[PDB]
Structure formats: C-alpha cells, structure tokens
Amino acid sequence: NVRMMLRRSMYKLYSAADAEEYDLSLVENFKRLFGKDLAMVFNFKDVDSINFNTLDNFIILLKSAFKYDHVKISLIFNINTNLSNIEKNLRQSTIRLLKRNYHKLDVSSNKGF
Amino acid sequence: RFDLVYLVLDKVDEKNDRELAKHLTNLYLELPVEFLTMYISYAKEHIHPIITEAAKTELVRAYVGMRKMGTATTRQLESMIRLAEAHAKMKLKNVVELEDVQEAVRLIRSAIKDYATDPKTGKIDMNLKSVIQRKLQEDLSREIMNVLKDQASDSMSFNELIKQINEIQEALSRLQQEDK
Amino acid sequence: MNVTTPEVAFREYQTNCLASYISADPDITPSNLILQGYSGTGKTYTLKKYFNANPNLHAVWLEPVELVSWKPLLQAIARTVQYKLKTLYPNIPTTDYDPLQVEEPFLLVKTLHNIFVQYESLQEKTCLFLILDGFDSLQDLDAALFNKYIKLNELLPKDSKINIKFIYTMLETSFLQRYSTHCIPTVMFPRYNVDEVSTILVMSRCGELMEDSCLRKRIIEEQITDCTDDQFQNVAANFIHLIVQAFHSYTGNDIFALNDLIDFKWPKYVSRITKENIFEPLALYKSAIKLFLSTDDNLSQTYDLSIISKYLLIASYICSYLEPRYDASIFSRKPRYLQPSLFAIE
Amino acid sequence: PGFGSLQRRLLQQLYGTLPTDEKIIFTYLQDCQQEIDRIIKQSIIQKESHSVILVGPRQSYKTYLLDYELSLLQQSYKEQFITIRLNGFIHSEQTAINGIATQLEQQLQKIHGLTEVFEKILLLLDSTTKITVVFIFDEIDTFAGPVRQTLLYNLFDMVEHSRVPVCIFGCTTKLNILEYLEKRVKSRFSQRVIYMPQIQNLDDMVDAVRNLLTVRSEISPWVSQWNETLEKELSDPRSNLNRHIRMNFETFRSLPTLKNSIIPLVATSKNFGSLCTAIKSCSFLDIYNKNQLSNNLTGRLQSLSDLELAILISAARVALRAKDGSFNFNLAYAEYEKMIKAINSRIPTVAPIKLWLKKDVKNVWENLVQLDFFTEKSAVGLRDNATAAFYASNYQFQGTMIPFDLRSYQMQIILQELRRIIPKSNMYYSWTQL
C-alpha cells in the first residue's frame, strides 16, 4: 500500500543519510538536517508483479516533491516484456507524467548474435 | 388490431353484491325491442356524419397522448374515427362532434382501463385520501380564496369561478364551514 | 477591514461567495466551509488567489495528499499553528508543547486550548483559517472522520481570542451528500466548458512556450529576422487550438490531459517549422498531419517467445475461454468479450 | 460608507452572535425554551439534581437554546453554575474521563481566580463551598452504543446521591433514544425526554424570517427604510421574495437551511441603494439553487464531449440489454463500433465519423469512471468508520487485479434519463432508445 511504501522509502532515506558523517517532512527538512541536496534513484525491481494502482498513487505522491528546490528524483523500471503491459495497466494520466522525460534501453543478453 | 377490449372484472364486495342480487332476484317474480330495431335501422338508413375540423384536431393530441405512454399502435387510430362516426350516427347528428370524439376517446380509455393500468409493468390496481389530494385541495382553496376577493366584488357566481379556475365544490363548502 | 474581490475568470460567483463567509470579524465567519469541485475545476488555484489578494488574512495550508493519514493530519495542524502563532506574534513570551504527542483528537483540542491560553492577553479576537485542500483525497478515509472536524470549534473556550475557522475542499459528490443535513455553507465548482478550457490553456501555456530553447534554436537555424513575440504567441495559440480541436473528444474538457499533449507534441511540431511555415498555419498543419492523426500518448514481434511458449499460450487461451464440455468433442478422434475462466494444468 | 455598519449588524444577526440581551427566541420555540429555563433555574437556584435530553433533527436550534440560557445566566449568576462539555464524535470513550477532569479543573481554577474520581469531584466542590454542575452532552446516541455505558450511568446515578446538585442536558437526533439507553441507564435516567417542536405553518416561517431580518437598534437612519422594505416584501403573499420563502417552506422546513441562502444575498449586497433593488426582485436565490445542483448527475452529464457521451450511451445500451445491468469495456467498444458502422452505412456513397482506436478510448473510459457515471459491480464505497477503512485499504479486491478492459461496471443513469436530459439536437439522440 502507499502508506507502507512511503514509510519504507523514508526509513531507507534516513538510514542512508545517517552514514553521511518517516514521511515527506523528512524530504522537506533534509537540507536543514544534513546540509546537502538530495537526489533519489528509485529502482522498481520487478514492475509486473507490482500492484499498478498502488504504483500509480505512489507516483502521484512523489510528484508532490517537486515543490522542494533541493530534490531530484530518478526512476528505474525493470521491464520483462515491453511497454505494452505498462500502457495497459497504468492510467493514461500517469503515463503522460512518465513520458515527458524517459529513456528506453534493451539490456537483454541476446542482441543480434 | 381490435377496436375495443373490455376488462369486465368481478370484485367481491357486500354492497355491490347486494345491489346486483336485489336487481336480479326481483326480476323473475310473477323501450320495446320493436322500437329499438326501428331506431337502429333508421340511423343506419339516413345519417352519414362527416368529421369536423375541430373534431379532427383532437385526434392528433389524443393519439399522441396514448403514444407517449409506451402498445399504442396505429390500429387504435382507426377506432378513434370508427367509434366517433358511430357516436354521431347514434346522436343522429349529421356531423361528428368534438364531444363525440372526446366521448369515444373516453370509452376507449375505460375499455382498456389505462388509468388503472401500471405504465411500468402493465399490472392493474386493485382499488381502481392521499397527500397529493391534500396538496391539490389546499392549493385550490388558496387560489379561490385569492380570486374571490381579487375581483372588484365581495362575491361572485360559482359557475364563473369554476370556469375561471379550471381553464372545487368541496373546497368552497369547507370554506363556508369555516365562514370564509 | 473590508475584503477585496479578485478577478478570477470563469469563477465569478464563487469568488464573491468567499467574501461572504470570510471576513475580519471572527464573530461573523462560520465555523466551517466546504468548497466542492472535481479534479481540474480550479478550486485550489481560486482559493490561493483569493488569499493572496488579501494578505491581511491568516491561514494555514496543508495537503492530505502529502499527509497520508489522519494522525499526520492532526500533527501538522498543531505544528503549523504553533509556528504561525510564533511568526505572527514574536513579541509575546510563550512556551512550547510537543506537536508529536498528538495521538487522539481530544489531545489536539487540549494542545490547541493550551496554546490559545498563552495568547489570552491579545488585544482583539483573531480569526484563523485552517485550509485542507482535497479533504476527500485522504488515502485512509471514513465517513465518521469528517464529523470530527465540523463540531470541533464549540469544544474550545468560546471567550478565547483565537478562533479556528476551518476551510475544506472536496472533489467527489458522493462524499458531500452524506452530510447534507448539517447545512454547512457550501460553494460549488462545475466542470469547465470546452470554450473555457480553450481560453484557460491559451492564457496559461502561451508564455511557457514562447520562451523554450527549441524554438529559439530553430529560429536561428531558419534565420527568421522578422519573428516577434506577438507572432510567437500567435504560433503557440495556433498550436494549442489545433491540439484542442483535434483531441477534445479524446481528453474531454480536462486541463491536465491537454497540457501533457501540448508538451509532448511541441518538439515534433517545432521540427516542422521552416521558412515557409511562418505565415501559413494551414501548411504547417499539413506538414504535421501525421502528428495529429495519432495521439502519441503511447509509451512507445510484440512478444518474443519460443515456439513452445507460443503454443503454450495458444492452448491456454483455448482453455480459458472454451467450455470443458467440448474438449473431447474437438480434440479427441472419437465469449470474445467475457472475463476468462480458470483451468487446470492437465 | 456608513451602510457597512448596518450590513455588519445584519450579518451578525444572521449568524446568531448577538449579545444575550438582543437575542431572540421564536414563538414556536418559546414554549420549550421557557420549560428548559425553568428546569435549569430550578436545578441551580433550588439546588435540585435533574436530567434532560433534547431530541430533534440537526439544524433545529437544539443546542442553541442551551447556549442562550447559559449566556443569560452568566450575566447575573456567575458563581452559581458549573458547565462541562463533551461531544461523542471527537471524544472517544477513553478520553471522556480525562476531558471531564480537565474541564472541571479549568472551571474550578477560573472560579477561584474510577468511582473515587467522581467522589473527589464531590469532595472538591464541598471543600470549596464550605455550585450546581451542569453537564452538557452532544450526541448521546454516540455514547449510547455497543460501548458499555459507564460515564452517563455514573452521571445519572449521581442525581440521587450527590451532595452537590448535578444537572445533565443531552442532544441526539434519533427518535429511538430509549432503545439506545439500556434498561439500567433508563431506570437511572429521569426520562424527561423533550422532543423539539417543528415549523408547521407558513406564517410560522414568515414570522421567523421577520425575527431574523428585523432590526431593533437605530444604528443608521436607513434602519427605518430597511424595516419598511422588509415589511413591504413580507406583506404581499404574492411577493417575489415571499415566493422564494413559500417554495423553501414547501420543499424543506429547516430554517437554518434557508438562512444559509439568505446570508449570501445580504453579504453580496454592495450598498443600500443597490440593496433596495436587489432585495425586491431577489433573482440571486435562483443562482444559488442552481449552483447547489451543479455537480449532480445532470451537471456532470452536461459537460461531456461527443465521444464521451457516445461511449456512455453505448454502455447504457449494454446495461439495458443485460439482465444484471452490468457491462464491460469490450462490450461498450463493440457497441460503439456497431453504432458507427450503422451511422456510416446510412450515408450515400461516392461515385469516382472516425471509429476511434481501442487505445485512445481508454482516456474516455477513465474519465467516465472518475465522474461517477460508472461503478464497480460490488463497490462498497466509503466506509463508515476508521477500523473498517483500515481493513478496506488492506484487502485487495478482484477489480484491482483483473485487466483494464475486463472490469465490470454498472450504470448510475438509465437511458430514460439520458433521453430526458440529452438535447434532441445532439447527433446521437436517435440512439438514446434501443
């Protein structure tokens, strides 16, 4: 669920910053807590098994972070088959949010022999 | 494609049963058919009624009203002139009157019994004081109370008031009971 | 003091209604107020514009979108009210209460009363508005939850200077109808009409697109000496009108969906602008026909499978849509639209 | 310039924040108000413990009477009464005892300037007097539920045994209060249930409107003109404003609901000169009423585009042909295809109406679910309480996993209402029927 997603994300974000030297208020307060800008890279390890409604809500939730001037977010999608499953399952509003800045790369072990 | 279908139902009720029983039981104790046949032959012999413009106009509205409650096929519109001409013949009037058309429409409606028929499922109410009756009576009483004094007279004839409002007796009787 | 009315177009009834329920006298403003409108109806924008038009007002902004559940919702209210009261009246010596100790609504009432007691020495009564945007957008929500926010003002000491005048915004209508008998003063927002959406997007994105790097690169490449910002705006407006007329049936009268098509097709549309297309939008449309014939909202041999995999899928589709009755009839030598049924491995 | 004082006076009068001296009680309320006043003063002055519950629907000026009476007593009986407030919506059964303790402590402190808890309340009162305690409870029915009734049980028990007088006034909308109050609490309760009176005459509502809009302070010289115009508009039964008043009465008879519409009219008024014209014709209440209805089914249906409307019509047709009334995206798109084929087939051909792709329709399908035209087959909807909402947010239904195009939906608008609402000039009006 979105609640568990945000809680675990903030937990890991705090744990990582603890070695420098649970909610969006942590993201707001990060620059005053550690004096540095925050860049987040999100690794969706297996997209097909993820509840796409929960993922869509989580993406909309993360969209609120752009109000902060010191936060940058990157998204990594491990796709097994194709963009077709994402286009079928996600809402067409969230697809437009993703598509404004995306890259497509075929990392399969088989490529033209 | 029939012209008239009559739903002649029997309801168990002591009062109507008494009326029918007292009509029947006293008949077998102890106009004539000749004149009836004479009248029937005469009317068919002489009168050939023609539909008037005003009588024609009401057919459109009656058929549209039967239509919008949709089994109101075009077949019943044949009856809406067949019965009118027969009514004009029975009156012996040489033309079909608007009253004749309205009576024929009423006869068709009563035969089919649409007013007691459920428009949703086609079922029939068994019974055929209500809040809509209360509201209509209250509004009518208020309107007649306003009108009876809005005119430059303290009182007026009830026929003129009825024609002015309907275009009633119970409401005015109740007002009289209240000395209004 | 008298409130000044903003000039928000396509909302010139609600901006006047807000002047009815919001005023400098805390004895006039009601204890509750709800603004109702679906997504993209302009509620947040209109309310923020109204508050920015009258700086003398005092407000707190929170988003249940960020505040996942009700406990953060109360904690943020307490913390932000404490900070705002310190900001507004630094001169008054005051102490602190922990905003992280709020576990139940009664504890919120207790903390609020304790804080307001400190400011009892205020000269005049103060009108404070707490703004929660999208109350029904809360992720963990229930019907009994909203009742706890309506009848909260009267648990305060009514003689206190600080009066909380809550403001809520709601999206749905199945939510608000549950509370009709409370007769809360409610202001409504309808969906924008097609003409309204067309005018609003032109008013909004024209300046955003008149200054993008791609067009001023392509102007240099094409050596457009006579290009002016007035013609720049006209080109952008032509682009927006073309997208609207081509995709209104696809998106509806929705501002958000059209904005993203305007963003996506904008580079490709720019790529077709040349010396010949400066003054003839018809020719540019002709050159850009293939861009309009396709939505291009798609994220893009469709499934690379072994022969065994392909035949397994073919058999599985038969299993999930053919009755078990016909297996022996068809395969032994002796529906397009319904949901698929289950089948066994054998 | 000076009209602002009169406008502020009127707005304050509308909101009921007048000083207790200037406060007004309606004639249909006065009979119960005097009875409540009698009970309160007999409890305080004569030191008699008593218990009362007010019953009636919401927005019935129910607790307003208690506020009026206590505000009146505050002017001349400052030391005599003690007030304790609780509300079942906010105060859970865990926090009620703490709320009582804290409120009692505050009241005692400002006056001076667990059976043992109640016993200590009585001991503190006795030791500080050597003062009648008035409990006011909102929503008795909330405490009177599956929660084991202890707090009200103790308060009603104290009526007989308290050395310091105890008075209880409650509120509840339910007419079946005695069902919620169990037999033990019923026995301990004094059972003087007061059901509030209802507005039952048009003259009653007209007099209430006069009481609300009357100005009895000579703040401005145009106060006389205000009262004159008000009586002009209330004198003729066929008045434009009286038309709205009668319609409101005949629709619903809660006066605060009508006040909720009158207040915008007064506040929106800019000056007395414009107010004189605005109050007479009173065309703004129509605008208010249409705004109140702008987000129902009709208002949402009026804004959809041609493609959205056509897909809605097709889905409604599918539901109509369905015994269960359900439909899915595939059937809706198939009916869309068939209707477009039929429309194109009724056109003369060429001598030598786009069938939208199944992918572009997905946005329209999403829009038709956002705007509450569609709903899931077994959509429970909004949960009543937080405990059930937690489980609902936990469990994942079938509709969250099945494909987008195979999610079953049902319809909120029947094709009869479609044909009633959709203009005849619409190009798909002919397909509104079967």
Next chain:
Amino acid sequence: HQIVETIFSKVKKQPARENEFASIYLSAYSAIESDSATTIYVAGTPGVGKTLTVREVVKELLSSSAQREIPDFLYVEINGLKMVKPTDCYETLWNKVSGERLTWAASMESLEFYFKRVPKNKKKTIVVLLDELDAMVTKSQDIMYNFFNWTTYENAKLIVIAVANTMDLPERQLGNKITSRIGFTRIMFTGYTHEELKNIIDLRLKGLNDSFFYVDTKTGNAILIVRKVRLRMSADAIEIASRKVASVSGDARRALKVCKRAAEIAEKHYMAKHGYGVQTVHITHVMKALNETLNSHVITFMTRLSFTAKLFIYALLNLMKKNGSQEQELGDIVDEIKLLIEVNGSNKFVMEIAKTLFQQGSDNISEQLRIISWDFVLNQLLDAGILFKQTMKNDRICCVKLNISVEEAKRAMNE
C-alpha cells in the same frame, strides 16, 4: 437569593422487602458466624431495590458486629458499570484489603495467595459486593470465575455478593465449572405490586399528606407546621399512578418520579394562578405524567414533516403494497415518485407542484434527475432513525427499509 420552597417542595424532596431482607441476613449471618467462605448471588429487574436490600443487610451486620454478636469484618463495594477497565477490579480489591498499589497481574496473584495460603487466624473477614456482575464479563470470564473460586477455599474467610440481571446466567452463559461453585445460593427479586408502590408513596409522604403550611403570600415560600394553607394528594391519583406503573415495570423509582412530576404539575398550576385553601394534587396531574410516558412523538413528528418527506413515505408504502416486500430499491422509489406525480392530470396546480418539486421552480435552469432536497430528506429520515439504509456507493441498487411499524405510517399519513 434565598432558596424559595413552595408548599409542594417537601413532596418532591421525599418497608416492602422484609422477607428478602430476612433471607439474605440469615444466610449472611450463618456464613460469617461460622467463619466460612461462600458466594451469594442476586438477580432481578432494575428498580426493585436489590442494591438497597443488600446495603441494609450489610449495615445491620455492621451493627451486629458493633454489638459483637459477630466478629469484625470488612466491607468492599465494587460496581461493574463504574470501572474504566476490567483489570481494575484486581487492583481495587487488593488496595482496599492490604493498601498496596501493585499491578493487576500482581494483585490477582496476591489475592490468590492471600485467600488460599494465609492462615485463618491471621485474617479479618472480608465481604465484597460485585454490583453489576454481568457487566464484568470478559472474553475468558476470569472475573466470573476467580472471585467465586476464592470462596471455595476454607482459608479464605471471604464473602462475595454478586448482582446480575438473570438467575440462570451461570447455566445460560457461564461454564459448569463456575455454575457448580455458585450452587443453590441464589435469590431473585420480584417487582412490586401496585398496592405496595402506593404504600411506599404514602410512606415517603406520611407526615406531609393533609398537613398544614405557612405560606408567604408575597413569594410563595412555605414552612411545614403569611397565611395558612393545606396540601393533599388524591388517593385515586396515587392509585392510577401505582396501577399504571406496576402494569409496565416493577421499578420503584418510576413511582417516585411520577409523584415528583405530579407535584411539579400542581406546582405549575399554583404558580400560574398566582403569577409570582387546600392544594389538592388532582388525578389529572398524575394522568399528565402517565400520558407523556405512553404517548409517542413519532406520529405527530411524521405528520409535521414537510411535503417531501410525506411524499417519500407514501411512495415507499405504495411500493411495498405493490411488491409484497418491505425494503425497496432506491431507484425504484425515485421512479415511483415520478409515476405518482404524473399519474394525476395536467392541471395547473399539478404543473406548479411538479415544477417546484422536480426543477426547484427555477426561471430557466431545469432538467434535474431527482426531486429537490431528495438527498436532504433521505438523510433526515435516516438520522432520525425512522428510515434505514444499507451502505453502498451504487446509489440505485441499494435497499431502503423502514424501522417503524407497517401500520402506524399509514395512520400518520391518514391524519
């Protein structure tokens, strides 16, 4: 200001359980004098004086202890509907016996150790009253068991008195383990008869009926024995008060309240006629109290509803009689409302009523799908408790069901 008390004040300010008192005292005396431990079980309807009789026995036993007919003993009173949490019973009992402030787990073990292990000669007899015993029932029923189980210990010297709603509760709800220990020691209280209530009323007013008072003519203040005034309450008024109450319930408090209400009504008449020689409380004063107890506000409230609510109720009743069922589909209801509006003619009054109901009578803004304030009246009939609805966000497949009787709604509509 001085507390002004009228002639009726003493009537409002102000014997039938001797057999029960003797039975409880005899059992209690036998157990206490023998230095034994046992359980006493009490049950009965509310208002019959179960608690009052127990208190009278305990006070008399204390008097016997003062006379040293029986040795010293300690009394502890606990009520089930007064504790905040069930575990507080263990802490309270240990605190009253030993004065310690240990936790509930420690107190329960301490109580278990105290009653079982401590020698009898090192103890004081303890009598514990568990009022509202059935309110202490937990999931494991430990409170129902442990307190009674301690009485089985010969070293306990503990007497436990329990008050519950029903006599057969151990058989109906509790296990056989607790039922056997409680045993035959059960006593049931029966509601009073009308003549017993009349006697109790007269007992409270023994020195006030037919008594004279000195009443200040300027203020109405009265002193029991400025002019001489007499007071009386009619025996027929008391008889009808006692008979009517006894036919409803055995609660003795109701009879006292009825007389208090009757005295207040007579007091109101006295004040109204004077506007501040025998003041006889007439039977009409009592009948006013009885009528307000019997009469229901439901019918008059429903008759006082707006036209919309009555129309809704009538449509629902018509749907019930057409369908032969109680609950009806909500969309069916909103369609039947339109059917009932349109079944009438095209008369101008009908047209105006329909325009007001369906499109608010607005100038041009129209075409609503449902009547105005339909949601308002649907929520009003539901918050009042008259109308019941099951919760779904599908507005038109939901069912609407009535709480009131099928008969009285028609009665209200026909008035």
